[PDB]
Amino acid sequence: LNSQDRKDLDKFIKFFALKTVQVIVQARLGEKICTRSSSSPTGSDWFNLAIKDIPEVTHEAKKALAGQLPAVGRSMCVEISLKTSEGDSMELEIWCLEMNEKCDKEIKVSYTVYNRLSLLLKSLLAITRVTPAYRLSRKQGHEYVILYRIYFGEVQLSGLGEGFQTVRVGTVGTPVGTITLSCAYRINLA
């Protein structure tokens, strides 16, 4: 429960949440994402991953968080929806970044929490390409588009249809709680 470890864990978590939004939204824009690797330490690439930030998304993500971090009862959710040219909307995905009360006492925030979050981000990248909404998002732009919303609070799972699936992207244990990242997605594309 050390102080310098607390300020660093909060910064790690905050930036992990911000990058989680960016990864999810960029996976639903309709374009392939191809970023560059560099041997040289850029000094500003969070979790050592080449994630170019979209400013609008960063602003929208900060407004939902409002200077707060995930905690028990306060989860960050990215909602992904389909909107037709005629105005119909169908919910596709709910990504939830949660933190629970379960603590990991012997875990080093200095680099072990950092590197596990970096791994979780990488799992997020892979998973966003293989859920049913990815193909829909790549084909978007004419009869429909893909919209997104960022809630911060209680997780509500309505709107995905009976029989929706949930995939756990992964978990990171920390001295103040365990981060869990998952996706609940609709399979009845009606």
Binding site: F15, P41, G43, S44, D45, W46, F47, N48, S110, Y111, Y114
Partner: peptide, 8 residues
């Protein structure tokens, strides 16, 4: 800004 260096 992220951690600039990692110590082992």
């Amino acid at each position: 800004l992220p951690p600039q260096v990692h110590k082992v």
